[PDB]
Structures are given as structure tokens and as C-alpha cells.
Design a protein around this ligand. Sequence first.
Ligand SMILES: C=N[C@@H](CC)C(=O)N[C@H]1/C=C\CC[C@H]2CC[C@@H](C(=O)NC(c3ccccc3)c3ccccc3)N2C1=O
Ligand SMILES: [Zn+2]
Length: 96
Amino acid sequence: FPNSTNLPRNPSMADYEARIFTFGTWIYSVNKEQLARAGFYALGEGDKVKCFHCGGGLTDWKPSEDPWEQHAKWYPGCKYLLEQKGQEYINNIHLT
Ligand SMILES: C=N[C@@H](CC)C(=O)N[C@H]1/C=C\CC[C@H]2CC[C@@H](C(=O)NC(c3ccccc3)c3ccccc3)N2C1=O
Ligand SMILES: [Zn+2]
């Protein structure tokens, strides 16, 4: 179950630097900057990633798909998400 509290499930991955580093060998076309910025880091197996905060896992990405958009699509309850895009952003992802 994703995290809903305000405590990062993976503290060691709270820095864009820490995270971005995991995409060192990334062979996929999904933009690793956006992924890291959206709060994800690579698990080194396939195109699987997780949110350092809510700890939600995402995989099987399509070319055009947007990290922030996805992160909100599947894990709305995430706080790190809430803090960067705000409730309004989220609500309109699900209502529309
Ligand atoms: C096309 N588009 C992509 C765009 C990101 C996509 O929609 N992928 C998801 C599609 C699949 C199924 C539903 C969903 C539900 C959320 C995850 C789940 O499947 N994540 C897994 C997982 C595995 C076992 C138990 C729980 C979750 C996961 C785990 C760790 C790292 C990466 C992925 N989900 C996805 O990743
Ligand atoms: Zn999250």
C-alpha cells in the first residue's frame, strides 16, 4: 500500500541527485530527469521504478507517458506528490 503519511519510505532516495544516479545505465526512452524529478529511482531490473516517498512502484512505461501524470494517476495519496503539484493538480488528473 503506498505511503500516505509525511515520512519518506526510502530516506536514502530523497535527493534528486541520489535518485538520478540510479538511471546511470537506463536503456529506456522515458526521460530519466522527469522520472527523478517526479520522485522515482530505478530498481535496476527492467523499467521498474519506485517513489522514494510513497514507495509506489511503476513499470512497463510507454514512450510518451509523463512521470508526474502517472505518479498521480496511480498513487494520488502520495505526499511528496501533493507537495510539488498540489491537490488541484491531482484532482483534475482523476476527474479528467
Ligand atoms: C502502460 N503504462 C505504465 C505507466 C507507468 C503503467 O500503467 N504501469 C502500471 C501497469 C500495470 C498494472 C497496474 C499498476 C498498479 C501499480 C503498478 C504495479 O503493477 N507496479 C508493480 C507491482 C508488483 C507487485 C505488487 C505491487 C506492485 C511494481 C513494483 C515495484 C517496482 C515497479 C513496479 N502498476 C503499473 O506499474
Ligand atoms: Zn510517491
